[PDB]
Amino acid sequence: KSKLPKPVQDLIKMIFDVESMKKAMVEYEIDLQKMPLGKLSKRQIQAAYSILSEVQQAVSQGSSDSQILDLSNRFYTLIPHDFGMKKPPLLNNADSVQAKAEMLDNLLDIEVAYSLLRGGSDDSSKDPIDVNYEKLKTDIKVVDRDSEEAEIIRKYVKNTHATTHNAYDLEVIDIFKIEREGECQRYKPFKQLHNRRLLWHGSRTTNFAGILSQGLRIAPPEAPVTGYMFGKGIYFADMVSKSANYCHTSQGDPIGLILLGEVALGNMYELKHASHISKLPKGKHSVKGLGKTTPDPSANISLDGVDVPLGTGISSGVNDTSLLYNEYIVYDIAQVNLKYLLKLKFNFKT
Ligand SMILES: CNC(=O)c1ccc(N2CCN(Cc3ccc4nc(C)c(=O)[nH]c4c3F)CC2)c(F)n1
């Protein structure tokens, strides 16, 4: 049996759960008989993205529902759905392409998780928790409850939960200090860049085996750039509740996972509305989606020379913006250095 700390053991079990991976596929209405977890491949996912891009071209160029029908069916051919003998819903709008682009992104992390678990060696004498921990190539340590870093992290959670996200409260169960193999060396050209912030990135439990082994990744080139508000980058938030909404927890599964990453923002390209960009303008290193609300800038604290925006939510002064809260997007995977992973219990008020 494993010598790993009990919170680390429970984390590994959580993220390598096969039935959670299956429950996530069922949520997307995928036919598991026509295509199980083991049939999932990058090749198929990329072909599905490419057809979604063709659907996107047909919708933006204003094709008829009779004309797009052919392209909508082509997607359902690559990613089988569970509708029985009924006709699938027509993908004739941007919301539909956005929803399908989002599902595919998630399937890309699920495929990594299942590949990791089904790859490798079988040894009965070794605890499967120890076996599955090594697959991640990440040093995972438990942060001491009474430490300074734990106090700062708990204040960030406590102070940046938005009023509009009050249908639930957050309880920090565990704090993990994480170190992905090779990530620190990848980050080096951006290590002393200006505008380095410790930001949130929430995701489903089924994404975290992929996130810890491959890191936060940008949607592939086949993916429709219009399926994402600020194009194809890595999205972060300064409001814990904005990111915790990406955990997709419920009364039937109230345990979520959220990251704290050091993001080299550099010169921010400030936007109030959707801009489906492929490349940043010269001199810019990130995109900042300007929210109506911002954590109080005079309340910013420093944790290992990185700015921590743990202030309470105040008005930014920004008018006529499409965002309630800020968002930060980087278009180079090297600009992210994962620092912490938090296990949270969501206490629903509904
Ligand atoms: C070659 N590419 C890959 O292998 C690959 C693997 C996974 C990918 N996804 C998984 C779904 N995820 C969803 C998502 C989106 C936005 C979020 N914005 C905030 C503030 C937050 O807090 N969370 C968010 C969020 F979770 C995005 C990244 C991906 F795009 N690509």
UniProtKB/Swiss-Prot annotation:
Annotated effect of mutating L52A: Increased auto-poly-ADP-ribosylation
Binding-site residues for NAD(+), renumbered to this chain: H201, G202, S203, G210, R217, S243
PARP alpha-helical domain location: 1-118
Mutagenesis / variant outcome for changing G210S: Does not affect DNA-independent poly-ADP-ribosyltransferase activity
Catalytic residues of the enzyme: E327
Listed result of changing M229V: <0.5% of wild-type activity
Glycyl lysine isopeptide (Lys-Gly) (interchain with G-Cter in SUMO1) cross-link site: K87
Variant or mutagenesis effect after changing H165E: Decreased polymerase activity, leading to the production of short poly-ADP-ribose chains
Listed result of changing G210L: Increased DNA-independent poly-ADP-ribosyltransferase activity
Phosphoserine PTM positions: S121, S125
Chain residue numbers at which the record places covalent cross-link Glycyl lysine isopeptide (Lys-Gly) (interchain with G-Cter in SUMO2): K87
Subunit structure: Interacts (when auto-poly-ADP-ribosylated) with AIFM1.
Record function comment: Promotes AIFM1-mediated apoptosis. This form, which translocates into the cytoplasm following cleavage by caspase-3 (CASP3) and caspase-7 (CASP7) in response to apoptosis, is auto-poly-ADP-ribosylated and serves as a poly-ADP-ribose carrier to induce AIFM1-mediated apoptosis.
Protein's name in the database: Poly [ADP-ribose] polymerase 1, processed C-terminus
Source organism of the structure: Homo sapiens
Portion held of the full protein: 662 to 1011 of 1014
